[PDB]
Each structure stands twice: as structure tokens, then as C-alpha cells.
Design an enzyme around this catalytic site. Structure first.
Site, PDB file in Angstrom:
ATOM      1  N   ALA A  65       0.866  -1.173   0.000  1.00  0.00           N
ATOM      2  CA  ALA A  65       0.000   0.000   0.000  1.00  0.00           C
ATOM      3  C   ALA A  65       0.911   1.234   0.000  1.00  0.00           C
ATOM      4  O   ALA A  65       2.066   1.152   0.414  1.00  0.00           O
ATOM      5  CB  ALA A  65      -0.879  -0.023   1.244  1.00  0.00           C
ATOM      6  N   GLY A  79      -0.196  -4.834   0.658  1.00  0.00           N
ATOM      7  CA  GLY A  79      -1.467  -4.715  -0.047  1.00  0.00           C
ATOM      8  C   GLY A  79      -1.461  -5.372  -1.427  1.00  0.00           C
ATOM      9  O   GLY A  79      -2.487  -5.819  -1.892  1.00  0.00           O
ATOM     10  N   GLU A 104      -2.131  -8.956  -0.901  1.00  0.00           N
ATOM     11  CA  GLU A 104      -3.554  -9.036  -0.556  1.00  0.00           C
ATOM     12  C   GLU A 104      -4.446  -8.883  -1.788  1.00  0.00           C
ATOM     13  O   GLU A 104      -5.454  -9.582  -1.920  1.00  0.00           O
ATOM     14  CB  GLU A 104      -3.873  -8.000   0.520  1.00  0.00           C
ATOM     15  CG  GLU A 104      -3.269  -8.383   1.875  1.00  0.00           C
ATOM     16  CD  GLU A 104      -3.258  -7.247   2.858  1.00  0.00           C
ATOM     17  OE1 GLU A 104      -2.803  -6.144   2.485  1.00  0.00           O
ATOM     18  OE2 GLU A 104      -3.673  -7.471   4.005  1.00  0.00           O
ATOM     19  N   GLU A 109       4.083  -5.771   6.494  1.00  0.00           N
ATOM     20  CA  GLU A 109       3.433  -4.742   7.325  1.00  0.00           C
ATOM     21  C   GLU A 109       4.085  -4.599   8.695  1.00  0.00           C
ATOM     22  O   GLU A 109       4.225  -3.464   9.188  1.00  0.00           O
ATOM     23  CB  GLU A 109       1.927  -5.021   7.469  1.00  0.00           C
ATOM     24  CG  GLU A 109       1.097  -4.668   6.235  1.00  0.00           C
ATOM     25  CD  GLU A 109       1.064  -5.754   5.166  1.00  0.00           C
ATOM     26  OE1 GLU A 109       1.828  -6.774   5.228  1.00  0.00           O
ATOM     27  OE2 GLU A 109       0.230  -5.591   4.243  1.00  0.00           O
TER      28      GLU A 109
END
Ligand code: NA
Ligand code: NA
Ligand code: NA
Lengths: 258, 258, 258
Positions: free
Chosen positions: C66, C109, C112, C132
Site C-alpha cells: 500500500a 497490499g 492481498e 506490514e
């Protein structure tokens, strides 16, 4: 604290080591060992200097079974009244990550001990099995529950009905273990992995562990909601600001949260 | 009992064999075969001399699909009113272990039959797929449910949307099957595995099978409670005392419980 | 529609392609990209000519994280009030199949995003991770939920606590991805897979996708009931009759249902 069935140490910064030490019994899990491991793990969980815990046995055996001399005389009512295996259940409530470092035999309760830990680092010599059926019982510490969730029905049924073991290679292939390394490198790998975890954010480590555990407790939709709430809450921490700022500033983070 | 689509036998002590025998149809699963397999399995489950059941097809096909000539004319109301596939569901209520021995094609309903069994021994020639989508339907016997639980979403989506097959090797790698052996060794391996299971404690075998099945019905916390209750109850049995005593006395157990 | 962070196209019949295009950021997932991908996917889902969607990045990165510059200043209340990541959740409501074609980095992300898609085709260069924790957070888009369900606890704990990546090979071995192909063949493989899916029955494709998704929402018994109801209902369709008749008549089906 002095222990009779285990040896504890702090071999590298941030890591607590619990070594199973019943060599005459190939580290079979008895009641004393259960209580001693739980006690040691709780002490490490309470120690601010420790970020991760490693559980290991000997080169020959992580743990070959629950102690059968102790179980042979058990009755259903005594097993229930004594809450047998409840100490091992309590180990699942330790908040910091636990890395199992498995060499040689991890059978029966020993395989279950590895599976209840968060990571499993296996020596190439590791052998994982659930031979409870050969003794006229079934697994009682997740050998039918955690094993099935990790490796699938067909492998769990094979292990628990036939008594065969998986090699480390097979265990890694089907999801039972995190990593395989040569036997001579096992403790070094496990201590390095544990120290890496211990260098991470403390609340983020707890949150990761809690969320992965929750993946087995809820349908995916509800697990996603749980994880999303946990994610929002991480933005409350100093470590989130520091971790992201360090990334952006191309420097090492200095995590401080407890 | 005389059957028209299967051949039954007792090839080795303690083992009942069900061989699918519709060679013109590559053992496609029709209504008659469903009822005959269920009947045979129920008879073996009731036979005190039998400890495990093996289901197999031919060298060319375990079962290539459900019978499409039979399904083409089906309507939703007739499928529902006839409780279509309910015989296969009933097979999951057989108490003794069932070992699928899979050579060649296990496609569609045939893959689902292998997955509903407890163990799968696959020949290196085995091919597993769910090509229902190519016929304008989806799997109706667990091809979206048991497959996903065994192999994961990405592989289940690939199989069920593209119609591709997995090789035995791939199937073993991702958890669909217990073991792979050369095609010439398949029946020998399956019969040896089944006889090994049949030499184990009867109540312990039932308990193992029941507990692994329960792993798919509950969150882990509740599954652990279920398994713990089952474990306590095993200490009520003669086989538990005999199995553990035999271990301690370095001798072979003589299991007697029904 | 003109987009600022993605490029859309219809490269082969029946397939919509969404290519992430933030090369300076290695396709990091920001708010704009989230909204643009959702918009593009919804348009493809509404387009009768399209049967499957492919999401891909560049040769170097599917998506590396992300966007951290965007998240660094986030607070828990702002994250919750803005429903952060809800666009990605909405992507799971697209009815047609989505194939992730992953080259190079799929981290945080980005991993994911690959996991929320239905299939994952990985280049041999693909690397999957959830780092993360290194930023003082945990995954918020299924990195603890979809990852654990795919690969098992031991690998999910390793990734999310240590920040290590899996290679494509390892990811395939433990169930994270559908297929691996050489990097030069990635887009060709993904487009061919997507076109194959697009040539299948539309309602059958939706039903397959819905049923596999439901496998993570219910215990097996209830999932089997869900799948059985869906199966009965397919016999209501023209495509079921045509698909089965085509099979029996040794010809290509001409699917027409919307
Ligand atoms: Na913040
Ligand atoms: Na007893
Ligand atoms: Na019909």
C-alpha cells in the site's frame, strides 16, 4: 527458577530459549514438563527485554510422544477432573511469538506441541507423526484439529489412522512447517528468526499473532472485519508512525512501544 | 448380494474392496452405482471382520464424471425431489475408514468421490479435475467445498473455472491426496494401508475419523474442546490400556474392542 | 473513462485487462488506484461481451505495498471514518471471475490484492510477502485471513512476523497461487486462462465463483447444503442442457445464457 525437565536461557538479545531435557524419555511430554514449559513461557512473556520465545528439544528428539508410563493408568474421570493437557492450552495464551525449532522426532504430543507454536523451523531430520491410534487412543492436543487445518484431510487421516510420519520435506510441502534447514543449522536459524521477530514492533507482533489465530475462529467475512478493526487500531501507536517514517526516510526504525 | 455396476471382495484379511465396474462408461457415477456402492459399504461397515474399506476403479479410470446421459434431462424440481446425490452423502456416515485408491481419471463426481473418502492413495497416472463448468453446471458433491478446503482457493478456482486437471504429483503437493505410488503398485499400497488401519483399535479408528471430520464443522476453539472430550473418553476402553501396556512391555498389542 | 493510475484494455475477445500503472511507486496501492480499479472492474462486470477480468502490474511489480506516503499520517478515527480499504472489499462483489497475473513484487497490499482475486497466475519472478510488521502495522486487507486460509498457520506466521517473501515456487507449493509460468509467458498465460473462462457458461461461472467463496463462510455440512441447492438450480438453465447435449453429441457447446 530451577527446573527438572527443561533448561532455559537467553542465548541472543531479545530471545528466550526453552530446551526440553528428558533425554532418557526422548523428551516425552509429562505433567511436570507441561507445567515447567508453561511457567518458563509465562516468565519470558512478562520479561520486557524478550521479544520472542524458542522451544526446542535435542538433536534426536523435539519430543517423542506424551509420556506413556504416566498415561497408561489414566481413567476418563481422572483425565477430566485434572484438566489434563490444560497447561498446553494455556501456552496458546502467551502473547509474544513462539518459534518451535524441531529436530528429529516430533511425534504425538510432540507434533502437537510444534503445531501449537506460531512458527515451526524444522531440521531436515525432523519427523512428524500422530501415532496415538497405535496406543488405542486418538490425539488430544490438536493432532486432529490443528493438523487437519494445516495439511488437509487426506494427509491428516493417513497420519492419524496409519501412524506414519512425514519427513520435514513432506511436512513443509503440505504446510505443517514454516522452513526447513540442515540439522547443523537448526538452532542458528531458529535464534536468528526469533531475534528478527524480537526486533519488530511489540504491539504489531501481538496484533499479527492474534489476527492469524483468529483466522481459525470465524468465517472469512467476520475475520476480515476483525482484521480491519485491528488494522485501524494500529494507527494509534507510536510504532506505526516511526515504522512508516523510517521507511520514507530510508533509515532504520527505532521501535519503542511495549 | 449381486451387483450390476460394482464388484466386491475381501482380498486380504480385514479389508473390504469395492471396485467400480462400468468400463463402457469409464465408471461414470450413475444412480445404480451410487446405491450399490452405498449398500456394499454399509455391509462392510456392519461386518465385524472388516476394519477398513477400499474403493477403486480400473487402471484407466477411478470414475470419469457423473453419468451425463442420466443428468442431461434432469430438472431442478426432479433433482430436489429425488434427493439427487444423497446416497453419496450417506456414504460419509460409514464409521470405518474408507481409502480411495485412484488410478487414471478421477473427474467431476469421480474427483468428489475420492475427496469424500478418508484417505486417497493415487497412482502416478491419476488425474483430478472438476470440469462441471464445461457442461454448463457446477460441482454438486463437494467439488467446490471439499476441494477448496484441501487445496486452497487459487487451485480450486482454477480447476472449477477452467476445467483443467491436476496430476497426481500436483494433487499431492497441494494436499488433495495422502500418497502417490507407481501405477503398478496402487492396489498393493491401498490394500496394505487398509490392512494396517484394520489392525488398529476399532474404537480409536472411529474416534480419529470422527474428530478429523469434525475439524471442518467448528471453529478451532470448539474443535479442540470436542477433541479433548473424545480423548478423555478413550481412557474408558480396554484397547487404550492394552495399547499403552504393549508399548511399555515392548510387545505387540492384542486389540479386542468392537 | 480516463484513468490516472491504471490502463484498461480488451486485448483478446471476452477479456478485460486492468494494468496497474504507477511505475514511480512500483504500483503501490493508493486511494485513487483503489477507486480506479473498482470502477474499471465494475464496468467490465456490466459489459455483456466480457467473461473474465485480468489484473496485472509491470514486469517489476504487481504492487509493492500500500502507498506508505499516504498512510503515514493516518489516525484510527480517520481510517475508520473513511472506510479505508472498502473499495478493495467491494471488488470481491464483482460477479465474473478475476485472474491476477503477478510478476515481480506482490508485497503487503499487493499480495492481498492477488489473494482477493479468484485465480493467481504467477511469473517465476513473483515474490509474495506481508511486511506490514516492519512498518509497525499488520495486514488490513486479508494478509492474516486469506493468507492463513491458503498457506497454513506456520507459513502465514513466518511471513507476517518476519517480513520474508515466498518465491513463486514456494507460493505454488503451499497453495497461494494457481499456476507458475516463465516471466516472458505471464500475460499470454493469464489472457489464455481468462479467455477459456470467458468461453464457459456465464451463470455456471458465477455459480462456481460464488460457491468457492462460500466455502470460507460456513461449516462443511452447511457448505455442502449450499452447493447442493446451487447444483439443483443449474438444471433450470439453457446452458446446462446445451453443455450436456454437446458432450453427448461429441460437439462444441454454444452457450447463450447471460
Ligand atoms: Na498515526
Ligand atoms: Na484406562
Ligand atoms: Na434441465
Amino acid at each position: 527458577t530451577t527446573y527438572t525437565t527443561i533448561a532455559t536461557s537467553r542465548p541472543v538479545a531479545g530471545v528466550g530459549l526453552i530446551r526440553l531435557d528428558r533425554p532418557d524419555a526422548l523428551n516425552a511430554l509429562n505433567q511436570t514438563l507441561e507445567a515447567e514449559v508453561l511457567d518458563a513461557a509465562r516468565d519470558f512473556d512478562a520479561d520486557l527485554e524478550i521479544g520472542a520465545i524458542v522451544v526446542t528439544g535435542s538433536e534426536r528428539a523435539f519430543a517423542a510422544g506424551a509420556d506413556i508410563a504416566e498415561m497408561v493408568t489414566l481413567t476418563p474421570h481422572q483425565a477430566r477432573e485434572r484438566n489434563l493437557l490444560s497447561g498446553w492450552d494455556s501456552l496458546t495464551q502467551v502473547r509474544k511469538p513462539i518459534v518451535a525449532a524441531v529436530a528429529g522426532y516430533a511425534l504425538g504430543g510432540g507434533c502437537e506441541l510444534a503445531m501449537l507454536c506460531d512458527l515451526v523451523i524444522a531440521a531436515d531430520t525432523a519427523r512428524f507423526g500422530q501415532p496415538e491410534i497405535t496406543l488405542g487412543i486418538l490425539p488430544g492436543l490438536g493432532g486432529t484439529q490443528r493438523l487437519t487445518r494445516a495439511v488437509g484431510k487426506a494427509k491428516a487421516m493417513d497420519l492419524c489412522l496409519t501412524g506414519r510420519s512425514l519427513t520435514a520435506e513432506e511436512a513443509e510441502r503440505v504446510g505443517l512447517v514454516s522452513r526447513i534447514v540442515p540439522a547443523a543449522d537448526l538452532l542458528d536459524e531458529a535464534l536468528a528468526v526469533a531475534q528478527r521477530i524480537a526486533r519488530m514492533s511489540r504491539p504489531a507482533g501481538r496484533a499479527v499473532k492474534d489476527a492469524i489465530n483468529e483466522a481459525f475462529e470465524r468465517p472469512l467475512s467476520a475475520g476480515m472485519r476483525y482484521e480491519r478493526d485491528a488494522f485501524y487500531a494500529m494507527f494509534d501507536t507510536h510504532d506505526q508512525t516511526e515504522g512508516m517514517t523510517a521507511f520514507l526516510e530510508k533509515r532504520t526504525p527505532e521501535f519503542t512501544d511495549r
